Amino acid sequence: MSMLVVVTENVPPRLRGRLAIWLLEVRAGVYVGDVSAKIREMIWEQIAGLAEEGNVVMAWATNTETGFEFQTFGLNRRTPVDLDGLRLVSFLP
Amino acid sequence: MSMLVVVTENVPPRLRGRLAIWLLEVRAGVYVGDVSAKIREMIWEQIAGLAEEGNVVMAWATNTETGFEFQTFGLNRRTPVDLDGLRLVSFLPV
Amino acid sequence: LPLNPIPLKDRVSMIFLQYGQIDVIDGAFVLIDKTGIRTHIPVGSVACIMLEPGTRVSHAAVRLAAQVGTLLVWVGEAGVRVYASGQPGGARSDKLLYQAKLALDEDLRLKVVRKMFELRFGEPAPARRSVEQLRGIEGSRVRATYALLAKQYGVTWNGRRYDTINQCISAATSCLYGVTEAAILAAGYAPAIGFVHTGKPLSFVYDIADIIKFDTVVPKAFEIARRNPGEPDREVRLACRDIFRSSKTLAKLIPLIEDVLAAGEIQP
Amino acid sequence: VSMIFLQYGQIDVIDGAFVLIDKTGIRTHIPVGSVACIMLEPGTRVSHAAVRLAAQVGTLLVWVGEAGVRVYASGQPGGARSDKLLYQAKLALDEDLRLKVVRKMFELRFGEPAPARRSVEQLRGIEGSRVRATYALLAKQYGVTWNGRTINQCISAATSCLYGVTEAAILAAGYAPAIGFVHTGKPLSFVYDIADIIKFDTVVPKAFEIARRNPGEPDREVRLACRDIFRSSKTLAKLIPLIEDVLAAGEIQPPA
Amino acid sequence: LPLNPIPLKDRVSMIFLQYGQIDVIDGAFVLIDKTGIRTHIPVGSVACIMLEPGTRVSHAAVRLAAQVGTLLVWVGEAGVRVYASGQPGARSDKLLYQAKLALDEDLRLKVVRKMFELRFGEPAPARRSVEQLRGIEGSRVRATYALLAKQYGVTWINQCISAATSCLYGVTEAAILAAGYAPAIGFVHTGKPLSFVYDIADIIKFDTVVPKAFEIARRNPGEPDREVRLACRDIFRSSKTLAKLIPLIEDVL
Amino acid sequence: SMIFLQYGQIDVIDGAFVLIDKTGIRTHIPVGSVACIMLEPGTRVSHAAVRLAAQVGTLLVWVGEAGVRVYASGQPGGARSDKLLYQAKLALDEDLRLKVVRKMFELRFGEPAPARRSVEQLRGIEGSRVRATYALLAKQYGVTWNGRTINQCISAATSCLYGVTEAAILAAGYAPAIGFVHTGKPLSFVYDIADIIKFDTVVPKAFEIARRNPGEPDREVRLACRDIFRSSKTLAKLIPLIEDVLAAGEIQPP
DNA sequence: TAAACACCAGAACGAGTAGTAAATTGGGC
DNA sequence: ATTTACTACTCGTTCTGGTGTTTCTCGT
């Protein structure tokens, strides 16, 4: 069981509702919760499926160097960048 | 050391920069990182001080019932609500 | 896309709703009130949702809550359970038939009651005692416990009512009865088929619950009763949440049930 | 003893009586007695006082789709009365009593008693051969292209509709849908047993009827068709006495 | 509001920046590139930032990074350390403590001996001076090096060793500065500006650089530098290098 | 030998330290000519610049305007150990304790310290004289002084002096943490040298500005000190002073 | 001179609401 | 009676590029 955070943008209400079934919508499109590994990977399947033309990023707590990892879906001005194993995000103009 | 998440809205660029010093800005006003307790409460002082007329919420991982806790600053349509110890957020209409 | 219930242990304990209408807005559990403020509730995170008077559930709400494997309990004064709704489908037939056979055989019913006894007090039950004789013994030990705890915490005790201290006890146990029933359903057993308790629609729920209720859950009701707060309901509910978390109750409920029925020496 | 289906309304208590409020606020008074089970079709919103009252009188609440087409949630989950569950169980734990009930299911399905000296799995063979025969026969009656089990989509949609009222009947009767006789091991085993008895009477010949046409909405118009059937033919109301008669074949005294 | 550096152990080990200008936007460390895309770097999260050729730092950048306690290292070919910038001094008590031990060769001997004992596991042989001990340490290093070439099967590559050790030298120096000691005042190594850095590092250097840097050299992957860096990164994480460096220094003294 | 570069990029052309501007080059620097380069705000260092400076042993210090504030310096903790141990040796032995502290006194006020009064006793004499100076200066500029707006000017002014003082210590190659009069604090040695020349120009300037009473006393004191350090060449005399300060120990310097 | 913040307009995007119209629904043993 | 999809419409914040002002959160 580790912390989970999902940020959705330009996503249909179908998914915005689905995420509210397990996670807590603290802000507009921002969901926070504490699930297990197995639960995290089903939410990602919900996101990958229900999100249309929208960009979503999911960050969860792990035992990596940073203490967390994150994967993205769809296009956004902020895309991940690999710095020798360490993953950061750059701002594309 | 536990996971940390900060969401800022309508905040001066001063704070948006300060948060980028320790946390990772994955989305517009959304910062994520893994810090300790004392470092977390230093971030909250940065928020409470530098945020002007803006609303900010900070969520961190714990060993509570939810598995996490969250604090808010400023006014917003989404305010926290206590349901017999349980903290959720409600959507206020105009 | 299909919706499936998550494991019980990964879920939050309970939530209490009191004044609002419960509808579904985009496939999500919401609680709208008279003023029209909305509150989103993660149903797939809660193992049981308690419904206090003043609540109005919608058809979609009850349907959704079933799909996610969340139990809905309509409760009375001090959280006493009234009605309950859940998936009619669910439970492998084997675990039901397994439970059934244990109740249909009078040799195997005693045996399984004995383990409940053994888990209850820590010591094996005395021999040459029938079910109703064992119930007599357990009943006497229960009132003994109640009396001593009242002396330990220093409360005025004269009886156990079902109509201030009793309000705390009943509320606390009602919390335990909630998650216990929710565990039995998720595990795949029937809450109606009991061993120690019979004739009642929640016989099996009481059986499992009474085993561990006095360990942590009950002595806390007494603690709060001495404190006598303006919010006895809220501070009892908030206490139980912490208990279920610390004692890992949800994670402990499923193996407890399976260990009890295992006493029948019959293949699971 | 009867049952009621309520739709499009709020279920509250305003004078110590079950009432059905409308958009306009029209009421319909329902006697708490005489009702053993209340089916809630989509569009319904139950109040706490209603649920409180229904519990006090011992009435079962089942959330159903249109005309009981699909079951979503049932009150008193797991089962209502302990004895009737054990009653069904004893019939299932003894394979001698299992045969008896299968034999009655057989007799009720086709109209003739099963041939003697046949085990459960021999009977499955016999009934299976006549079912594919029926399907073929119906295919000739409506004149559709049949090769095995568009047509299958209609039948499958139709049977799913039937499973609703059947399961809803088992719940209203007070038994468990997991404990079956012909079908076993699955959580809806008992539902399949009763359903296959009457599927060919009306439900299947209708699936074929729509199958002969080819509308753009075969799924929903089969469901809406079954909906009309269950209402007009009062199927569920006929289901409950059938179930108790089926279990009565075990020659064991039934509960109060 | 004031900004103070967080503990070293809570931080990420290393980051490498190349080909771009490093400015400060709204009070934050950013890296603008040729195309003009920007990249924000949590400078208060990193214990050491390596600056490869092609980088152009701004005045505000170096100033900001110092206050947050991040070490800036200008690195050469295959990650060799060139220059370093940091807070212009740190603690007087910890420094004088280090100094006094270096001014007396009787107390210098003690510290050289413990470094020896911690390196190989056995106490150093008696009746041998500081300059005599170097022969023993020198011989075991070349002996070690030869043995490892036999274990992994290489012909005795240097690019991998130098890159790995240089990474360790970065965080080591960053640890010494954060602790409040001087990287220039060494005991085993002398004459060089990173004497104390080399002293602490080689105690534990053979522990990982050898079992893993050598492994990478024989596999001979394309772009050997990055696969050495990510390797060292995992080590610092798994072996909890940063959290153990500070108590190691005080234990040595 | 030190130089201050501002408003420009620091690159290397033709194997020499250069400062590139929009106009294209403003200052050509022979690599063997500067012993320490101070970088004022507006500067952007290149990698090639830093690479060259390490090879030749040149110290880079990021300073504010005219060295008013130090932020980051190359060669952290100290460059060569000997210059540090030299500083260290002077502070750790109490025989060598009187040393420059008497001389700092002699350099501060102009008169030699009493021949047999200890350090904390010397602290008392200078302590009595500093409060006297403060009061005396306050009477000439005609400001209201009763103890230690005016204090805001002095505190701002001393902070400016602490900048160039530390910048001198770094350029000299010594550690600002190892002090003689002040101890235990990370800028102890900075305070020692600063108090020697603090009253000469820096303090008389704070009082002068305090008398006019501006709306923004903090900023106009620093810019004044900024101008002082440049015109009066404060930094250039600081470095030989420090080496002169440490020379009082009668111990061989590096 | 260069680098960087504060301030002020503008465009550009997504969240949110009110209104109208369509369903009562993602299945098979 | 409830719920969802679809359609404008308002509102909100983020973001950019334009000038003008600064080289800076102080004590030892």
Short mmCIF file of C-alpha atoms in Angstrom, two decimals, chain C residues 100 104 193, chain D residues 81-93 97 101 175 179 181 243-255:
data_model
loop_
_atom_site.label_atom_id
_atom_site.label_comp_id
_atom_site.label_asym_id
_atom_site.label_seq_id
_atom_site.Cartn_x
_atom_site.Cartn_y
_atom_site.Cartn_z
CA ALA C 100 -24.27 -24.99 5.59
CA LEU C 104 -26.79 -29.17 9.51
CA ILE C 193 -26.39 -19.14 9.23
CA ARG D 81 -34.08 -16.49 7.03
CA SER D 82 -31.51 -19.10 8.10
CA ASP D 83 -33.74 -22.19 7.91
CA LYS D 84 -34.82 -21.74 4.28
CA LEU D 85 -31.17 -21.45 3.29
CA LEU D 86 -30.37 -24.64 5.20
CA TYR D 87 -33.49 -26.19 3.63
CA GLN D 88 -32.10 -25.57 0.14
CA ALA D 89 -28.69 -26.75 1.33
CA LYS D 90 -29.78 -30.14 2.69
CA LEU D 91 -31.36 -30.88 -0.69
CA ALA D 92 -28.00 -30.11 -2.29
CA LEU D 93 -25.77 -31.97 0.17
CA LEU D 97 -32.37 -35.66 -2.91
CA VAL D 101 -35.38 -32.15 -7.68
CA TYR D 175 -33.40 -18.81 -1.16
CA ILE D 179 -26.90 -23.31 -4.60
CA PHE D 181 -29.16 -28.51 -8.71
CA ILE D 243 -39.58 -22.65 -6.97
CA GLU D 244 -41.11 -23.95 -3.74
CA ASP D 245 -42.81 -26.74 -5.69
CA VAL D 246 -39.50 -27.64 -7.34
CA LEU D 247 -37.77 -27.94 -3.96
CA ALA D 248 -40.79 -29.87 -2.64
CA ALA D 249 -39.74 -32.80 -4.85
CA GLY D 250 -37.17 -33.69 -2.20
CA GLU D 251 -39.97 -35.15 -0.06
CA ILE D 252 -38.70 -33.17 2.93
CA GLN D 253 -40.91 -30.96 5.12
CA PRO D 254 -40.59 -27.29 4.06
CA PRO D 255 -40.09 -24.43 6.58
#
